[PDB]
Paper text:
As molecules of highly lipidic character found in the circulatory system, cPAs are bound and transported by the main extracellular lipid binding protein–serum albumin. Serum albumin is a three-domain helical protein which binds up to seven medium or long chain fatty acids (FAs). Here, we present the detailed interactions between human serum albumin (HSA) and equine serum albumin (ESA) with a derivative of cPA, 1-O-myristoyl-sn-glycerol-2,3-cyclic phosphorodithioate (Myr-2S-cPA). The crystal structures of the investigated albumin complexes show a different number and location of Myr-2S-cPA binding sites in both proteins, indicating a species-dependent manner of cPA binding.
The structure of HSA–Myr-2S-cPA, determined at the resolution of 2.26 Å in the P1 space group with two monomers of HSA in the asymmetric unit, reveals three unique binding sites of Myr-2S-cPA in each monomer. The identified binding sites of Myr-2S-cPA in HSA are: Drug Site 2 (DS2) of subdomain IIIA, fatty acid site 5 (FA5) of subdomain IIIB and the chamber created at the interface between domains II and III, which is formed in the elongation of Drug Site I (DS1) of subdomain IIA. Myr-2S-cPA/1 is located in the DS2 pocket, a typical binding site for more bulky molecules. The electrostatic interactions involve both sulfur atoms of the ligand, which are hydrogen bonded with the side chains of Ser342, Arg348 and Arg485. The aliphatic chain of Myr-2S-cPA/1 spreads across the big central chamber and anchors in the hydrophobic part of DS2. The aliphatic chain of Myr-2S-cPA/2 is anchored at the bottom of the FA5 via the van der Waals contacts with the side chains of Phe502, Phe507, Phe509, Leu532, Phe551, Leu575, Val576, and extends up to the entrance, where the polar head of the ligand is placed. The cyclic head of Myr-2S-cPA/2 is oriented alongside the side chain of Lys525 and forms two hydrogen bonds between its sulfur atoms and Nζ of Lys525. The Myr-2S-cPA/3 is bound in the site located at the interface of domains II and III, in the centre of serum albumin molecule. The terminal part of the aliphatic tail of Myr-2S-cPA/3 is placed in the central compartment of DS1 of subdomain IIA; however its central part and the polar head, after the passage between Trp214 and Phe211, crosses the normal boundaries of DS1 through a narrow tunnel to reach an additional chamber. Myr-2S-cPA/3 is not directly hydrogen bonded to the protein; however, there are water-mediated bonds created between the ligand and two waters.
Numbering used by the authors: 3 to 584
The structure:
Amino acid sequence: HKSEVAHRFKDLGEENFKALVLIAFAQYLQQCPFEDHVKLVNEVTEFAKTCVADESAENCDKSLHTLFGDKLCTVATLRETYGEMADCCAKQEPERNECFLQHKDDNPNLPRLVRPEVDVMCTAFHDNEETFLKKYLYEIARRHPYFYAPELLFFAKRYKAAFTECCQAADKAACLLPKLDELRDEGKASSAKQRLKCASLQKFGERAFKAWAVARLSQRFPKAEFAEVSKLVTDLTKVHTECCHGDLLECADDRADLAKYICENQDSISSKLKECCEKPLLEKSHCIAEVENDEMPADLPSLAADFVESKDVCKNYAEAKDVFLGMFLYEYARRHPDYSVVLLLRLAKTYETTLEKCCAAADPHECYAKVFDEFKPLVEEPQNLIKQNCELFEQLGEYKFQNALLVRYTKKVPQVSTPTLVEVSRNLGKVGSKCCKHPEAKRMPCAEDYLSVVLNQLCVLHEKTPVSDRVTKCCTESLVNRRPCFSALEVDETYVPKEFNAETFTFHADICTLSEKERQIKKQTALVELVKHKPKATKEQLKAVMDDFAAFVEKCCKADDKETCFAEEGKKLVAASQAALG
Ligand SMILES: CCCCCCCCCCCCCC(=O)OC[C@H]1COP(=S)([S-])O1
Ligand SMILES: CCCCCCCCCCCCCC(=O)OC[C@H]1COP(=S)([S-])O1
Ligand SMILES: CCCCCCCCCCCCCC(=O)OC[C@H]1COP(=S)([S-])O1
């Protein structure tokens, strides 16, 4: 452990070094221009080469935290642009690093990234691949300062990948846009996931974390023994506390350590891990984290014998409540890779509650004999909601399913601003489209994965700008209750129709030719506004107005005077619609 900077440089290679160093700096020095970072990354890459050459070269023996910090404190911008972050520079490691970390801006205040036009991207990528890509890595990293830098990097490669394939196809646009689309969505899910995982530990607590991890691991590693699973829970629990409450390097090593452990112990954990364990170490923690579930062992006993029929049920649980509960979780989850983790947690909490009651009562065995019956309707409630929505998704297709949702949710919580309802409803559609393509057995974990981030960003947004007690309630509920709390929102009976504003419902020739996304958003925006303005309109009535709007758009995009048609036919569409909805 002589020269840490050389150790990493060799561990990572030059390409990954420079990328990670670029990200690391963009994440802390979020306002600085790209070229300033690129100079900081050269300076640091040049400097690191020496340490690979001569470990006893100067400064090469310094810790990474020290090097990184020294480097941050050299930037001329520091006090002017980052205020008190400059003050971290008067402190010594380890409090200097700690200080640098407390001052990172959760939400930078920056314009969004304009997806440029496909010509422009493919030309930049041809003309100057390095700068194109890295500039986008900086832009994303500065906008996502907590995003675990090696997770960013893995995205970048997929981007690059898409550009290689797509920048040389006939119809570049249609090779690439769906790839950019999926990647954008995945990238957001992924950053949102990480915010959720660190928030949820503070919020829901450590017992819940462990309960989540147990469930999750056990589905993935169903051949593993409770002992091995428990061990993994504990290290993963540590690992998450370091990645959430600590900095990059603590986390990377904590992660390489768990990965290393896992790869040494594969036969005790999973037969599915060999591809991952022969990845370069950087990718190794990631590949593991995304591995398929190992096959269940065959002929697994029913859980009745250990958890219901045994007369030691109350004794074994009392001896150690959490251990028995976790073993419950382990057994239930390894058998059910088809459940969301969170459903598995509802199940275990129902069991726990059932045991706290029954173990005190006159005849404990009799009282908890019906506990597995308590499970059926917990399991079947999300299996039925998936089925209903995926049937509907099939019928309507993504866009009209998003429109069905908008109406549903606008009537639920009509106080939510219109863009948020649009985004959220577009995102829920994207989730449907994603998860409904999986078979029934993979629907629930999928849904849990994306919904959990959709719903948590909704709650992060709404916390900032509360407009509903009902949304607050769902956002502050327990882990197991949040989603069912959302599913139980009803139509808001007390809401006062929004006032009519004719401009809102005016439309132009442009709507005929805008990009698909753009065109949808404008229509969906207006649909939200319509439900806000006419919240007691029936489905039949809203379909009538949407059928008219449809006919209006189709006519005015076939007209030769489009500008005139849109102002005149649209005047009349409005008038008709106002009379129709009283
Ligand atoms: C402001 C509007 C926000 C709307 C959010 C409403 C709740 C989302 C309902 C989505 C329907 C999809 C099916 C479904 O909910 O099941 C998902 C599984 C995954 O975790 P669980 S709680 S076991 O349920
Ligand atoms: C996944 C990569 C590493 C392997 C397992 C890591 C364990 C993750 C630790 C706990 C994460 C908790 C996040 C959470 O509480 O999710 C909220 C869910 C439950 O209902 P919904 S609203 S669908 O969202
Ligand atoms: C009563 C106040 C005035 C309201 C007049 C409102 C008419 C327009 C309302 C927004 C448009 C409804 C949303 C809608 O267009 O979606 C339906 C589908 C039908 O085919 P497309 S044109 S691809 O869009």
